[PDB]
Amino acid sequence: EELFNALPQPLQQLSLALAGEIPLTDHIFEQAASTWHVQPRSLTYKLLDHIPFSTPVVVPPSIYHSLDWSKCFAVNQDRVERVPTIDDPDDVYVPNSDIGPLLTSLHTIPDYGFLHPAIENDATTLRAERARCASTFYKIASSQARQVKLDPIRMLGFLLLVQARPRVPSGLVTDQPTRRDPTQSPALHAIWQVMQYYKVAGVYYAPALVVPSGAIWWIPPPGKRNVVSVQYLLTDLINLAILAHMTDMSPTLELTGVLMYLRAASSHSHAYTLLQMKSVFPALSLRSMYRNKGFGGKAPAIEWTEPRSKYKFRWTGVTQLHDGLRPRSPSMDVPTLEVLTKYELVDIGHIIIRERNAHPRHNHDSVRFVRDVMALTSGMYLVRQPTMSVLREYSQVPDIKDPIPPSAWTGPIGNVRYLLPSVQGPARHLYDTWRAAARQIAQDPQWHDPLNQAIMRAQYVTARGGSSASLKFALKVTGIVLPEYDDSKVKKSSKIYQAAQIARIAFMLLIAAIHAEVTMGIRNQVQRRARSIMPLNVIQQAISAPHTLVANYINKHMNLSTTSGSVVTDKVIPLILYASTPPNTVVNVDIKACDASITYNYFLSVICGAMHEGFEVGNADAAFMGVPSTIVSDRRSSVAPYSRPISGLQTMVQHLADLYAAGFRYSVSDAFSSGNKFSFPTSTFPSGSTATSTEHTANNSTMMEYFLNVHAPSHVKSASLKRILTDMTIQRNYVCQGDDGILLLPHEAASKISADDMNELLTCLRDYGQLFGWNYDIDWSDTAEYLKLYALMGCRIPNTSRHPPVGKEYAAPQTDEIWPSLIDIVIGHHLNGVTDVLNWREWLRFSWAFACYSSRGGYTNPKGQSFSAQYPWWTFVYLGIPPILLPGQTPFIHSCYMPPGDQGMFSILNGWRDWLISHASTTLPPLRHNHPVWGLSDVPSLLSQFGVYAGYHAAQHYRRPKPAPETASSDSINQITSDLTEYLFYDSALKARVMKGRYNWERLSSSLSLNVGSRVPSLFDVPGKWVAAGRDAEKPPPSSVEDMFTSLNRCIRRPTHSFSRLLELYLRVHVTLGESIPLAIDPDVPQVAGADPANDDHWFKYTCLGDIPSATRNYFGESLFVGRVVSGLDVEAVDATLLRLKILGAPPEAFIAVLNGIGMSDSEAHQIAGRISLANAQLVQIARVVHLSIPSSWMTLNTGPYIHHHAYDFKPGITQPSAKSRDKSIWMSPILKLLCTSYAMTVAGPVRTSIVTEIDGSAAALSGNLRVWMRDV
RNA sequence: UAUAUAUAUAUAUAUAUAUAUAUAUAUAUAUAUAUAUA
RNA sequence: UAUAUAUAUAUAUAUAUAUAUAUAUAUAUAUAUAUAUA
RNA sequence: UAUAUAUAUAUAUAUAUAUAUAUAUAUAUAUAUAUAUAUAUAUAUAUAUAUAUAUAUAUA
Structure with a gap:
């Protein structure tokens, strides 16, 4: 491969290492990383010369037909709009212009350019129209190019590097070499x-070239011109x-995708063109697979347990599959082909359909084909001008087909x-439902509990926020002089900052x-319009x-919130799998725009009235959250009005209804556009975060229930439909979350409807939704779409395109x-490639290349010095990426499921133990006195030699700079603190509780001499955590950056030869793997596409x-003792401390002090403390308790039973008696099991005992040391 | 001039039957290549 | 040279899919004729 | 409306006193580490004295 020869020497070495030829080393690791940072990026394109392509792709010159930008922008009412070219009012995206x-030209790199300083000045100062239009166009065009985790050329360099040389085979009998090869990929040739x-x-x-401030462009010579769409x-x-390489797809499918992109790029508005024909691929493949005669195969048999509310499946x-079970819905070929005719791409459909017809039976190949084809949709984060976005989305009002008459x-x-x-009618149903719920809320001593009140107030504060300026104006307007704490370097717009200002004021004054006004923000998306974030101010959120x-x-x-408890998101996985099984028929529904359709004229007025009436049952004089009772005029009786x-x-309702009727007042201040705030x-509901899901899910469920039980039976015609439509209810036939919803039919007897x-x-x-202005946007294709998860016949399909x-x-x-x-970006990037099932061997190779480039970096002072560093x-x-090849081992023996952190280290060392010990003995002189785990062979020196x-x-070191304090600012810190504490401790009982708990705790911890300095979670530190978060949200000063680099380098250079105490002790254990466990399911049946x-x-x-997570006896530890806690503190810290105390055998008052330290009253503290026991714990x-946790990668597997009865901590016939845990096994055995299963999951191949x-x-010595460490921390 | 109904002709769509072509799967025969045995 | 296994090609048979032609039925559009109304 | 004088209030500057916070210096106490000195114990080396053995020289 002459391309391999084209690479520079360090990169050739790196490619050899990635191919598994040689063990990787820090030396070559640096040489590759360094040289990438110094050579110009164009050379990566230069590499393409050495590929003899043989693919039938032609790039039409139609691309280079820049449409003039001047006609794609205009300003009216002093705002820069997009003035769409086509008559379609939605063509509001970036045009295709030169x-x-x-x-202009840059002084550093003369070839590339940036915007004219004259243009931006005139747009800023003169507000000149054409200047502004040019500026806006330049800004957004640059922004669209910036929507990448790093420069695309670097990624291309990675792909070439890994693909430059075939990987060496491992000894595994299933290690198939790659079938796909270069010179056949249409993409590269294109x-x-x-x-x-x-x-x-x-x-x-x-x-173009991406930079931290956006992207720059190259000045074209007089002959040529660069259209932004090309980038x-x-x-x-x-x-x-x-x-395509990672998914290992046929070149034919890649060819179609290339033609797909080319056709889109040829026309104007590359983004808009792609957006229009978005759903073509899933419709061609996923929505229509088995509409033929030769149907068959194997499918999962999943059962939903009787207490369906629990969402437990077996x-x-x-x-066996057969023709009677084949899907009933019509195919999707006709509409898609009709659409494709518009863009004369019917060949793509013909190719896809013909290829699809080669999979008549459901098996691994069929789903693998589906996964690959669905991976062809564009993965670009589309972005448009926020002004157009806000103007296009919120300009919609629902159309009600039968409004409530005023009478x-x-x-x-x-x-x-x-x-x-x-x-x-439905309105009556809605009214009664909300009224009934309001009644239940009305009398509820759960509130007025001071602890619960603390939870609600604390829930309102986060590091982010908005609308602070509106807040300061409105209160200053009413004569309220708020405090300020600017010297405490924290953002004013943070919800924390405004909360501190409010703490002292009597609430009613703020009404x-x-x-x-409420500010707004925009978050872009991959396959749809950008989302909206509308953060209310703290007061509005309280009301x-x-x-x-x-x-x-x-x-x-x-309907138990229809999974909106969100306890673990994986509970929807078995649900959709069950919903997609042959015996069941499922229908996917979702409100077209629930945020835009909920409104006051129809919906909110009914809810407000119901809530206000529902609260009538209750003491008329009972203040709630500082809002006192008041006198209102009642005019229901024209003859006898009164107050x-x-x-x-x-x-609260009185004001809330007033606000809703007035409609939300937003203020847009988009930065990409120029001077156009x-x-x-609008009546559009805020719906900026999960706090809105509750309302929409409630209304969603209500309307659906009324439709099923009342409207449909009264209106439908088919007697058979009536027969099956009856005996059906939402609690066992319907789920939803916000707009999204799933409806599944009762099993038609051995048949289909x-x-x-x-x-x-x-x-x-559809008509029922049309009545009150809900476009239901339903579909029926015998598949499962819920929360962006896709299942086909009980097999999950990862939609990889959503993770470009x-x-x-x-x-x-x-x-x-x-x-x-x-670095963190790399780690998160790699995990997706594991969550989505890609070719695990090749994905790992690409991941390391990405890591190598990321391993190195530098910084320069605003005026002064430069700084640099890079990691071994x-x-x-340690961060969780398996090594490809260790010295003395064979490449590709470590599975991606290897846990991060100490567990991964321990498992690696455990497998690597014997070779290290023996090799160290030959290579190095013995150490001077005996070692617990090692012999005299002195492996630690060898490990240091390996760095x-x-x-x-190094991985332990922090990666974000720290802001610095100040003393007059500390008066504001105290002022910030005092007020945050004041806001937190509205009453006095909580303050008394916490103070007593803290005083007792330190007294006990020191006197009993457990330890001193134990940072125990307590409420007094919650404001401190808030303050730190608030200060952290600020852009750090350069000095902090310089401290980081210096500290990091020193941590790298400091010669240390010891891990953490836990890992040191963990190495004392020897673990071995037996035979494979009995299988869970038939290997024939596919469960995840690509896991074949x-x-x-x-x-x-x-x-x-x-x-299927099936913890029938484990429950994965979700039964935490402290169900109710305040924000800021960590439950996982609290229970860890409690169990640690219990193992240490602390006296009960120690537990009492700790529990009282987080607001628990003495009585409940005793009640909670009694529950603590080593038996019921999972x-x-x-x-x-020793930070041994389950990796996120395992959350999709049924690891419970294995850990329970497959990880033998003491097999009688194998274990040495020295390892017998004896009585401490009650808390020792779980630790050993966790270590064992971690090692088992580390190695590749089938799971073994x-x-x-x-x-x-x-074992006694191990337990003793652990108890010491537990006491120390 | 227009609307409505009926008949006839032509075009398009859908269903069924027959013929031809192409693709895919399975079986059988023949040829060629590679491996193993004699 | 023969046997056995694997791969590829060609021929024949059977099944499935798609396309084209012809026939029949149904729907829609257009033209012409006849009737009725304006 | 203006000027001059006196009194009172408010703002700004400067000086002094008191309180609180932060920094620096000095003193005292306590803990930990290192060095040095003195005493006691054990080990090793060297020197001197006495006894015994072996070798060599001289005398009888």
């Missing part, structure tokens, strides 16, 4: 052809090329109107401020409390981040353990 004329336009003297000038096309091509065998209301109650009893509370009660006490008191809850109101009845049913539902390898969202014109953060590669091992300690400690004999290790791991619950065989020291 950016060239707007460029990149070659298109890039031929950008060379002048064989130099291959990149069309986007390159990114899509590179992303597709990487994905795998109970397999089911249907009673007389006013000051603001609200009650609903007349004579009114029926006028709730009718104030809306009743709305949330009632919604919560509706959810938690009707009566109303409780604080009702007063303004404010306009007529599509005719389905059409009748679906039609009526290169793409990353950036919501601001500047990246605003520092170099070390890139062992860091990434293991350097990497091990080709991708062996995933296929092994899933097959052995089974995917394996993971107790094992976490794990057995402790020996502890070098006695």
